[PDB]
Structure formats: C-alpha cells, structure tokens
Amino acid sequence: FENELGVQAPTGFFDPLGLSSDGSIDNFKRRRASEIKHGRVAMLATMGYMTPEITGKFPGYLSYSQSIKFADVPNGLAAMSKVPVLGWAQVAAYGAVCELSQDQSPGTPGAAGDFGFKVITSEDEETLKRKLNSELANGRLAMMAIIGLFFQDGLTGGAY
Amino acid sequence: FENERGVQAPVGYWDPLGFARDGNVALFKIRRATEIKHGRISMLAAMGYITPEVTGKFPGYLSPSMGLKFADIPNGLAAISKVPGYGWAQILGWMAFCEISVDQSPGKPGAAGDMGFKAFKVTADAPETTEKKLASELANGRLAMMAIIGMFFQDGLTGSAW
Amino acid sequence: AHPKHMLVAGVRGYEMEWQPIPGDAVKYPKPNSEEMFKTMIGADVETGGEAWDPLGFHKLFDRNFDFNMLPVYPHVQWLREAEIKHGRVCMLAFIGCFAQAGYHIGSYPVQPDWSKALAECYASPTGAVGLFQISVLIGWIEGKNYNGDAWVGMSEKEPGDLGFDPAGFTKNPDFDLKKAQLQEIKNGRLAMVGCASIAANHFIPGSVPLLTGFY
Amino acid sequence: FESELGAQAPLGFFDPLKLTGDGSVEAFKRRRQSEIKHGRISMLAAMGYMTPEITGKFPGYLSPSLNLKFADVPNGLAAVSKVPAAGWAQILGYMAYCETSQDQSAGTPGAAGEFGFKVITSDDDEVLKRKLASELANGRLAMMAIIGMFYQDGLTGSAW
Numbered sequence: 001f002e003n004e005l006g007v008q009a010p011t012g013f014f015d016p017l018g019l020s021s022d023g024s025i026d027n028f029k030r031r032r033a034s035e036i037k038h039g040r041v042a043m044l045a046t047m048g049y050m051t052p053e054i055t056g057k058f059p060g061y062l063s064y065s066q067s068i069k070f071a072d073v074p075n076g077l078a079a080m081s082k083v084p085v086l087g088w089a090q091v092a093a094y095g096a097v098c099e100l101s102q103d104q105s106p107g108t109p110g111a112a113g114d115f116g117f118k119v120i121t122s123e124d125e126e127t128l129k130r131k132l133n134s135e136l137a138n139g140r141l142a143m144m145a146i147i148g149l150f151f152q153d154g155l156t157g158g159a160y
Numbered sequence: 161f162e163n164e165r166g167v168q169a170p171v172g173y174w175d176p177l178g179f180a181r182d183g184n185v186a187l188f189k190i191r192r193a194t195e196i197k198h199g200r201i202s203m204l205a206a207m208g209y210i211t212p213e214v215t216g217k218f219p220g221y222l223s224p225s226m227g228l229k230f231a232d233i234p235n236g237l238a239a240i241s242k243v244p245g246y247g248w249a250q251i252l253g254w255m256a257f258c259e260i261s262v263d264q265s266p267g268k269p270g271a272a273g274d275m276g277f278k279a280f281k282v283t284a285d286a287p288e289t290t291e292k293k294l295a296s297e298l299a300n301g302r303l304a305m306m307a308i309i310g311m312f313f314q315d316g317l318t319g320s321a322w
Numbered sequence: 323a324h325p326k327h328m329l330v331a332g333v334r335g336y337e338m339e340w341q342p343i344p345g346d347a348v349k350y351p352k353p354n355s356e357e358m359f360k361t362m363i364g365a366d367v368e369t370g371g372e373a374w375d376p377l378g379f380h381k382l383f384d385r386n387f388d389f390n391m392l393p394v395y396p397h398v399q400w401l402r403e404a405e406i407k408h409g410r411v412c413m414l415a416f417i418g419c420f421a422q423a424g425y426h427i428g429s430y431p432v433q434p435d436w437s438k439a440l441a442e443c444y445a446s447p448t449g450a451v452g453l454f455q456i457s458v459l460i461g462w463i464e465g466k467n468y469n470g471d472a473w474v475g476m477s478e479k480e481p482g483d484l485g486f487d488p489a490g491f492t493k494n495p496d497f498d499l500k501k502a503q504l505q506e507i508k509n510g511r512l513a514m515v516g517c518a519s520i521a522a523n524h525f526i527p528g529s530v531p532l533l534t535g536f537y
Numbered sequence: 538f539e540s541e542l543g544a545q546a547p548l549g550f551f552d553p554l555k556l557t558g559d560g561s562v563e564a565f566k567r568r569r570q571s572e573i574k575h576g577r578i579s580m581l582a583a584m585g586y587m588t589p590e591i592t593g594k595f596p597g598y599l600s601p602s603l604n605l606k607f608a609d610v611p612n613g614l615a616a617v618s619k620v621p622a623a624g625w626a627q628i629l630g631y632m633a634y635c636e637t638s639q640d641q642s643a644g645t646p647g648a649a650g651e652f653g654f655k656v657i658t659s660d661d662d663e664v665l666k667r668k669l670a671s672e673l674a675n676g677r678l679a680m681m682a683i684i685g686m687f688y689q690d691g692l693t694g695s696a697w
C-alpha cells in the first residue's frame with residue numbers, strides 16, 4: 001500500500017509491525033478513517049491546551065446555574081472534573097451530530113475524512129495532495145503532543 | 161471362558177464354585193465389567209489408605225469455612241464422620257457422574273471396561289501390549305480388592321488405620 | 323372462498339402478516355422455526371449433542387398458525403437473538419458486579435454494592451446525566467440493530483450481528499466463526515447462570531457456596 | 538529411531554527401558570509431543586522460578602481489589618496459596634486456550650509441537666533441525682532443573 005497520503009519526507013511506509021497482513025484493504029480504510037479522526041481531534045485538543053495559557057481563559061461563566069466560571073475551571077485533565085457534566089453531555093451531543101449527521105460507513109466519503117467541510121480546500125490534485133498530507137502529518141504530530149500533554153498534566157500535577 | 165483376560169500363570173481358569181462354567185456369555189460380560197470396576201475402585205481405595213501414611217495428609221483445608229485442614233481428619237473408616245457431609249456428597253456426585261456419563265449396558269463399549277478415560281495412554285496397532293496392560297489391570301484389581309477388604313478389617317479390629 | 327377483504331386472523335385464505343413498526347412494509351411469515359432449529363448453531367456435547375429444547379419453546383411460532391394465525395409467540399430466530407443479547411448483557415453484568423465492589427470511576431455515589439448503585443446513581447444530580455447518556459447510547463445501538471423482524475424469522479442478519487468487529491475476526495480465512503459463535507452462546511448462558519446465582523445469593527444467602535460474603 | 542531429533546552428542550539413543558517394545562512410531566510421536574510440551578512448560582517454569590530472584594518481583598498489585606502486590610506474594614511453591622484463586626483460574630484459562638485452540642490430535646502439526654509460534658525460526662532446514670534439537674535439549678534440562686528447584690523449595694524453607 002503506497003501513494004495513500006501517508007509517506008512523507010523524513011519517513012516512508014513506517015510499519016515496524018503495522019498493517020500486519022500487508023493487505024486487507026477494508027482494515028486499512030477503517031484505519032485511515034481512524035487515524036484522520038484521531039489526528040483532527042488531537043490537533044483540536046493541543047490547540048485547546050495552548051489557547052487558554054497563551055490567551056486567557058474565556059470571560060464568561062460556562063454555568064450560570066452552578067455558578068462555575070471559565071476563569072475558575074483549571075486547564076488540563078483537571079477540567080474534566082470541573083466542567084459541569086451537563087456540559088460534557090452537550091459536548092457528546094455535538095460529537096453525535098458531528099458523527100451521525102453524515103454517514104461514514106466503509107466506502108462512503110465519510111470513511112475517508114470527507115465530511116464536506118472544505119473551507120481550507122484547494123483546487124489542483126497536487127495541491128489537494130499537499131493540503132491532505134499537511135493535515136495528516138499535523139494530526140500525527142498532534143496525537144503525539146496531545147498524549148504527551150496528557151502525561152505532563154497527569155504527572156506534574158498541573159497544565160505544565 | 162478359559163481364553164479371556166484374567167486366566168494367568170499362578171492359577172488357571174479359576175472357578176472353585178459353579179459360577180460361569182455354563183456358557184452364559186452375557187452373564188460373564190456382566191461379571192467381567194463388575195470385576196474391572198470393583199478392581200479400579202479398590203486400587204483407588206488402596207492408594208487412598210497407603211498414601212496418607214507413606215507421605216502424609218494433603219497440605220490444605222478441605223473446608224475453609226469449617227477449617228478441617230485435611231490433616232486433622234484421620235485415615236480409614238474414621239474420616240466417614242470427619243469429612244464434611246457436602247464433601248462426601250461431592251465425592252459421590254463425581255462417582256455418579258463417572259457412572260452416568262458412560263452408558264454401561266449390553267454390547268456398547270462401556271460394558272467391557274472402556275469408560276472413555278483414555279489416560280494410561282496405550283497406542284493402537286500394538287495389541288499384545290494393550291492386552292498385557294489390561295491383564296495387569298485385572299490382576300492388580302483383584303489383589304487390591306482382597307487388600308482393601310483386609311485393610312478395612314485391620315482398621316476395624318485394631319481401631320485405627322493400620 | 324372469502325373475498326380479498328374481510329380477511330383477518332382465522333378467516334380462510336388469510337395470509338399471516340407482521341407489521342409492528344409504523345413505517346415498515348408488511349411482512350408475511352412462513353412457519354419455519356422448526357426448520358431453522360434443525361440447522362441452528364448450539365447443541366454441544368453437554369446435552370448429548372442434540373438441540374436441548376424441552377417444553378418446545380422453538381415450536382410455538384409454528385403453532386401460531388394453529389392458534390390464531392397471529393405472531394403471538396416468537397420465532398426461534400428471535401429466541402436466539404434474545405439469548406445472545408442476554409448472554410452479552412449478563413457477561414457485562416457479572417464483570418460489573420465483581421468490578422464495582424473494588425473499582426470506582428466517575429462522580430457517581432460511592433456504592434460498591436451492585437443492588438444499590440443503580441438507584442443511587444438515579445438520585446445523583448451528576449449521575450442522572452451519565453445514566454441518561456448511557457441510555458441514549460444503548461437506545462441508539464439497539465434501534466440501529468433493531469432486529470425485531472426476527473420475531474417472525476426474517477431478520478436478514480444472523481443473530482447477534484451488530485455492526486461491531488474492530489479486530490480481524492469474521493474476515494480471516496482461519497478462525498472458524500461457528501466455534502466462536504458457540505463459545506459466545508455458551509459463555510453467555512454461563513454468565514446468565516452466574517447472574518442468577520448472584521441474585522439468589524443476594525436474596526437467599528448461602529445459596530451459591532462461593533459468593534457467601536458477596537453483596 | 539536414532540535419526541528422529543534428540544540423540545545429541547552426549548550419550549546416544551537414551552532408552553534404558555523404553556521404545557524397546559515394538560517401536561510403534563505413533564507411540565514415539567505421542568511421547569515426543571508430550572516431551573516438547575513438558576519441555577516448553579518446564580522452560581517457562583524454570584525461567585519464572587529464577588527470574589523473581591534475578592530481577593525483583595513485578596512492579597504492581599496483581600490484585601488491586603484484594604490489595605495484594607507482586608512483591609508480597611512469596612516466590613515459588615508458597616505462591617500457589619497466595620496468588621488469587623481467580624488469578625490461578627485465569628492462568629489455567631490461558632493454558633486451556635493454548636491447549637484447545639489448535640488441534641493436538643495425531644497426524645497434525647499440533648502433534649509435533651507445531652502450533653505457529655514462528656518467532657525463533659529460520660529457513661535453512663538444517664538450521665531448523667538444529668534449533669528444534671536445541672529446544673528439545675533445553676526442555677529436558679529445564680524439566681530436570683524445575684523438578685530439582687521444586688524439591689529444593691519443598692525440603693528447604695523457601696526458594697534456593
């Protein structure tokens with residue numbers, strides 16, 4: 001399996017044991033959807049780890065009923081136990097309307113990261129290649145940095 | 161009936177009384193199955209007497225709730241009261257499962273001693289080695305039957321195990 | 323015979339109908355049931371190698387045509403679907419019963435006892451939201467795999483065939499899926515027996531002589 | 538029966554009383570299956586009975602609910618009554634999966650220890666035979682070693 005937007009500059013078909021059968025195109029398509037979704041979520045999560053620190057936490061409350069404030073929710077893994085769980089349920093609802101609105105069954109465009117977002121799309125198939133591989137490489141670096149920040153918060157006891 | 165297993169070197173076809181000796185092949189099959197099963201259960205009982213004395217009682221409890229601790233229980237015609245009633249029930253249940261899982265009855269392979277227990281691994285296409293093992297099983301079963309009855313009597317008269 | 327209309331249930335010439343869901347076309351079920359039972363996964367050595375169904379619960383759907391020509395009793399396909407679902411739910415329930423007593427995850431009230439955790443999480447302001455999320459997720463994964471039509475023996479899917487197989491199973495040339503299905507079914511029955519034992523111990527102490535100290 | 542594995546440079550065909558009955562190639566095959574299985578089991582047993590001494594007991598609990606630790610379970614024959622009963626049940630379950638997944642009946646790869654481990658292997662048939670004989674020799678040595686270790690643990694107060 002080559003040409004599938006996965007081989008980059010400092011690396012090739014990086015599989016110490018990945019793609020164990022070196023086939024099973026259905027498994028590989030599922031893994032492609034998995035990796036692209038993981039990368040997008042990670043990029044967002046690292047983004048949201050480094051936004052509150054470099055740009056002060058939101059000015060509002062985030063909970064008028066529970067008297068919580070944005071400036072009172074700690075940044076990092078501790079926020080999961082501070083954000084009101086109705087808020088996490090609403091985040092789950094947004095994830096649902098973001099996952100179940102458009103189908104992502106195998107074969108469908110949803111199974112290839114094609115959720116019709118565009119906005120930062122391009123025009124030429126080579127420019128398409130550039131944008132897609134940029135997104136994928138940034139997502140891999142994201143995943144790495146996001147689990148790194150997870151462990152930094154877990155061990156150091158704070159955001160950094 | 162003088163060509164079957166059993167009949168051996170020390171005594172030939174042994175029949176002081178009138179059992180068999182009148183044909184009745186089915187009756188002989190029943191008696192052979194009875195002899196084999198009795199010899200097996202006997203051999204097991206013989207070991208169950210010798211082992212708790214030669215080595216020692218098991219390192220455990222046998223009743224973690226009641227704390228019987230194996231070794232507290234004596235050996236022979238006196239564990240009948242010490243071993244918990246549910247323990248005896250489980251032992252008899254295992255024996256009943258061994259009896260009913262197989263189908264001892266006329267003709268079927270369970271009526272000749274083959275109870276599906278294929279340990280003591282003996283190979284096919286090598287008879288007269290399977291037959292020697294079966295004859296040894298019969299002889300050891302007979303010896304163990306007489307021995308276990310003698311051990312019963314020894315414990316009963318002497319008041320304790322051996 | 324009787325005209326095309328006026329045909330309901332016991333009238334001669336009335337083809338059996340099955341349309342419980344408003345929005346789905348009418349389905350006309352054949353008896354089957356016994357025919358599907360004769361070629362059905364299960365029936366291992368533990369019961370003699372034959373399909374152990376005393377009381378004839380798999381034949382009642384065939385007897386529907388004799389009773390009132392109505393799908394009152396489930397098809398054997400529905401029975402296998404229910405058995406599979408019960409087995410999976412009971413596996414999870416047994417693991418949960420023996421994991422909640424030692425582990426705690428969320429902001430739910432601390433209740434190691436399994437018989438009280440559900441109610442105490444109902445009462446929790448930050449437990450009701452979580453149980454609502456669990457309920458909506460279960461409802462999604464249950465209505466998506468609605469089966470339902472297995473009640474009349476036409477499910478178009480083998481029992482317990484939700485859209486879930488992250489590993490390579492059901493696709494590898496090896497790993498005979500018949501043995502895996504038999505293992506799943508038998509372990510599910512085992513888990514259901516275990517859950518029944520847990521309930522009996524909770525209500526009648528000393529019933530199962532291995533969970534005496536358990537909740 | 539000289540050429541069927543074993544029969545290493547030390548001594549020859551060691552059978553003071555065995556295999557002298559009739560040969561019975563299938564009986565020898567069954568005994569070779571048993572020998573390979575016992576050798577693998579005893580190699581694992583010797584390694585796991587000497588490792589808790591070469592290296593400290595694993596860092597962890599092995600039973601968080603029962604508050605046990607890998608470090609407070611005595612090594613050796615004293616561990617049979619210390620490892621949790623469910624832990625022994627799971628170990629026996631993994632053993633049963635090993636013994637029941639692939640067929641081990643006669644005239645099958647499972648009858649010669651051929652299950653598909655394939656990690657220590659090669660392609661040169663001579664090297665394959667050499668490695669198989671090495672496995673058999675190490676297995677016999679481990680059988681005797683683990684029996685001796687068990688008896689040292691029993692007669693003495695602890696391991697070694």
Ligand code: CLA
Nearest residue numbers: 164165166167172173174179180191192194195198302305
């Ligand atoms: C349950 C007991 C039992 C049974 C059913 C059999 C059955 C058989 N034996 Mg056998 N045998 C036994 C015990 C038994 N044996 C014991 C313990 C010995 C060792 C002394 C032998 C030694 C032996 C030899 C040497 C031979 C047989 C042979 C045979 C077969 C010929 C048919 C026959 O006479 O059996 C009929 C079975 C009986 C009559 C059993 C009745 C038991 C009596 C009535 C009760 C009293 C016995 C004893 C003295 C009581 C002790 C306890 C008491 C103090 C309370 C037959 C299959 C022959 C053979 O192989 O033929 C091919 C043969 O040559 N047996």
Ligand code: CLA
Nearest residue numbers: 362363364365373374375379380401402404405511514518
């Ligand atoms: C309600 C759960 C449930 C359901 C729907 C099924 C369904 C089925 N089982 Mg099954 N089974 C279950 C639980 C269940 N099983 C449990 C817990 C065990 C362990 C004992 C078994 C053991 C088992 C075996 C060994 C076999 C089946 C077979 C079958 C199939 C035909 C039998 C039939 O029509 O019964 C469906 C109808 C019911 C099960 C009605 C259940 C309602 C009764 C009245 C409840 C009474 C139990 C009560 C609580 C007492 C508890 C007893 C204790 C042991 C727990 C069918 C697919 C056979 C098969 O595979 O055929 C190919 C077969 O050979 N089952």
Ligand code: CLA
Nearest residue numbers: 541542543544549550551555556568569571572575677680
């Ligand atoms: C599980 C045990 C086991 C088994 C099944 C085998 C099986 C085999 N070995 Mg073998 N072997 C073993 C252990 C075993 N070995 C050990 C531990 C050693 C090291 C001393 C050897 C050394 C060895 C050599 C050097 C050779 C074989 C050979 C053979 C093969 C032909 C010989 C034969 O038929 O023996 C059948 C198996 C047996 C007779 C094992 C019986 C074990 C006895 C009955 C019990 C011993 C008890 C022990 C000493 C004390 C334990 C404590 C006690 C107080 C409780 C055969 C496949 C030969 C070969 O490769 O042939 C091609 C050959 O040349 N073996």
Ligand code: KC1
Nearest residue numbers: 222223224225226243244246247248250251252254531532
């Ligand atoms: C794998 C299934 C299984 C389990 C799980 C299990 C467990 C327990 N067995 Mg059992 N067992 C078998 C199977 C199982 N036993 C089999 C096949 C046999 C061969 C016949 C057998 C033999 C005995 C005997 C002789 C005794 C015994 C007992 C207990 C006991 C203690 C409870 C208590 O005291 O707390 C517990 C927990 C002792 C007893 O005390 O029974 C009240 C007792 O004397 N068992």
Ligand code: KC1
Nearest residue numbers: 080085088091092095428429430448449451452453455456
């Ligand atoms: C990335 C977004 C995200 C976060 C960050 C997040 C976090 C938490 N989720 Mg959540 N979640 C989703 C998204 C997210 N969840 C999605 C898409 C689903 C559907 C698959 C889903 C399902 C459930 C369920 C079923 C439960 C649940 C809960 C909690 C909980 C504990 C709060 C606490 O104990 O205070 C925390 C911190 C459990 C709970 O306890 O709620 C009371 C509960 O039962 N979640």
Ligand code: KC1
Nearest residue numbers: 424599600601602603620621622623624625627628629631
């Ligand atoms: C991915 C599947 C999986 C899970 C999820 C899982 C989980 C737990 N294992 Mg387990 N396990 C395997 C698989 C899994 N184990 C496998 C393949 C083996 C090799 C045979 C194995 C071995 C042991 C042993 C030896 C013990 C053990 C235990 C526990 C335990 C503790 C519960 C508690 O005490 O909180 C929990 C939660 C200990 C025990 O006591 O269980 C009651 C213990 O002694 N496990």
Ligand SMILES: CC1=C(C#C/C(C)=C/C=C/C(C)=C/C=C/C=C(C)/C=C/C=C(C)/C=C/[C@@]23O[C@]2(C)C[C@@H](O)CC3(C)C)C(C)(C)C[C@H](O)C1
Nearest residue numbers: 014015016017018041042045048075076077079143146147
């Ligand atoms: C933002 C935010 C939050 C958040 C968040 C979220 C959702 C964070 C998300 C984190 C996320 C998404 C973490 C997963 C990463 C995926 C990984 C690590 C995959 C690795 C996979 C690897 C390393 C595999 C590599 C392979 O080499 C192997 C092994 C075999 C090779 O052949 C093939 C390849 C190359 C593939 C909180 C926590 C809710 C509160 C906080 O306050 C605010």
